[PDB]
């Protein structure tokens, strides 16, 4: 039976007209009756404006309410702050798929409030380490550079490292439009037996991009599988901390309380870290390294590690947390910590983007640690692993031989290196280079990879096992 009948009790909310002090984004109350630590408040301005705030610290009968949407206008005499009795909690239901939500959980589209199945708490709870199970099958992303040789497994949490101005913010839209299991591609049985979904989460996106996301998911068919959590750059930063927690709570719902898989996207976690700096400095904490709070790693992990398959429940959350390289250096705390928690990295490279390539995925540094789980006979074709290995090897050969073309001249390169230059040109221009709206099935992308590797004679494909060459090279 459903034990949700406990929600019928009404809890009257106290309404304090005792905002004694105001300091930056904080307001300080007094004579408060048992102020809960983390507790959303409906802070009323003198003119009547409701302005949500979150309690940030308590001391006896004083609660330091942190106020969203700035603080200007909050006086000491007329403002009245009302304590909702519980911390912020998203209203969840199996039919939010197709709602573009604001940063703070309110639907920003023209639709109505979600007919909540449950009011799940935001922070959720850590997943029992004994209850995890290893990522197994591919979660195809439609991007040729990512699907074949940077593959993503159901449960992996692999980021897309990105420079400041690179189109990563469009690769996110491409993935969210084209993501999906390979079971429909397998065509051996009903691939829609276990549904798929996505919970996009844009953080710190400027309006010229948030509107692009909304338009590009509405216009294409991706909305009926997506819960787009948009918060703007000028939306309150506390909502910017909230949004990834919101999206991961929705993902945990959709993936464990229901059964459908989900490929959650966290756009520009660097902006989330920027907002976390503001929260840390609001609490008067001293800055840790680089200005980010010392507990950066804890509040990044408490986002990333809310993903992975689960023993018993069939669903699985796949993270692709996109983040902007602050100054294009791995040594920066945010890329470093994310690569220290996540299962790999998928670079987007300025050098390739300046050549006009799209996507500008840089394969040489990008790697998926647990790719080998999502590659094999059962999921994708059996040649996928060796095709990936050989493509990476020949790409490295092509890159260094392109470096040597200017040193030893073109004519003095071994025939392997000449074929490798030809392969690198065709590779970067036809395989990595993918139309923004071109959905390439992993089987189709492997077919292109084979049509690209058959430049070389069978003997020069040393990386591929002969049992695969003897049946895939010629076709």
């Amino acid at each position: 039976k459903k034990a949700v009948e406990q929600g019928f009790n009404v809890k009257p909310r106290l309404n304090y007209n005792t905002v004694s002090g105001v300091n930056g984004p904080l307001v300080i109350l007094e004579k408060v009756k048992f102020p809960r630590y983390n507790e959303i408040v409906n802070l009323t301005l003198p003119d009547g404006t409701v302005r949500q705030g979150q309690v940030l610290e308590i001391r006896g009968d004083r609660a330091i309410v942190q106020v969203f949407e700035g603080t200007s206008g909050i006086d000491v005499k007329k403002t009245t702050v009302e304590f909702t009795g519980e911390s912020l909690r998203i209203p969840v239901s199996e039919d939010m798929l197709g709602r573009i939500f604001d940063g703070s959980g309110r639907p920003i589209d023209n639709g109505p409030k979600v007919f909540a199945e449950d009011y799940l708490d935001i922070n959720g709870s850590p997943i029992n380490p004994y209850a995890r199970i290893y990522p197994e099958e591919m979660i195809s992303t439609g991007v040729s550079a990512i699907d074949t040789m940077n593959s993503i497994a159901r449960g992996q949490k692999i980021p897309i490292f990105s420079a400041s101005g690179l189109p990563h913010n469009e690769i996110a839209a491409q993935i969210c439009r084209q993501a999906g299991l390979v079971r429909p591609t397998k065509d051996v049985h009903d691939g829609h037996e276990e549904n798929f979904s996505i919970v996009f989460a844009a953080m710190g996106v400027n309006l010229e991009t948030a509107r692009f996301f909304k338009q590009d998911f509405e216009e294409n068919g991706s909305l009926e599988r997506t819960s787009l959590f948009l918060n703007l750059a000028n939306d309150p930063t506390i909502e910017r901390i909230i949004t990834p927690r919101l999206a991961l709570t929705t993902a945990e719902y959709l993936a464990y309380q229901t059964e459908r898989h989900v490929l959650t996207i966290l756009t520009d976690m660097s902006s989330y870290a920027d907002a976390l700096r503001e929260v840390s400095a609001a609490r008067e904490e001293v800055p840790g390294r680089r200005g980010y709070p010392g507990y950066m790693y804890t509040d990044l992990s408490t986002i990333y590690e809310r993903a992975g398959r689960v023993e018993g429940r069939n669903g699985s959350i796949t993270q692709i947390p996109i983040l902007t390289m602050p100054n294009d250096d791995i040594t920066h705390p945010i890329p470093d910590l994310t690569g220290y928690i996540t299962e790999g990295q998928i670079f987007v490279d300025r050098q390739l983007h300046n050549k006009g390539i799209y996507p500008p995925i840089n394969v040489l540094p990008s790697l998926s640690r647990l790719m080998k789980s999502a590659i094999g006979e059962g999921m994708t074709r059996k040649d996928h692993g060796d095709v990936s290995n050989q493509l990476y090897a020949k790409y490295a050969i092509g890159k260094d031989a392109a470096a040597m073309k200017a040193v030893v001249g073109e004519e003095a390169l071994s025939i392997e290196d000449k074929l490798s230059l030809e392969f690198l040109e065709k590779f970067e221009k036809t395989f990595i280079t993918q139309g923004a709206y071109e959905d390439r099935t992993v089987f189709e992308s492997l077919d292109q990879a084979w049509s690209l590797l058959r430049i070389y004679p069978k003997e020069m494909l040393n990386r591929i096992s002969p049992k695969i060459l003897d049946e895939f090279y010629d076709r």
Binding site: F8, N9, V10, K11, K33, F34
Partner: protein, 56 residues
């Protein structure tokens, strides 16, 4: 292009026709369960939980 435009119009009409059934089912369920949901809501609103806050 003309066929696509005509198909868009026909698809809008067909989508309205399809959503009409779901809306009818929703109205039927609401008309069936309103007399009970309203009663439960009125009972919950009119019956208070007089209890001093824990940490009394």
């Amino acid at each position: 292009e003309q066929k696509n435009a005509g198909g868009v119009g026909e698809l809008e009409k067909k989508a309205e026709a399809g959503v009409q059934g779901e809306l009818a089912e929703i109205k039927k369920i609401a008309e069936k369960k309103k007399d009970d949901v309203v009663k439960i809501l009125i009972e919950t609103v009119i019956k208070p939980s007089a209890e001093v806050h824990i940490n009394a």
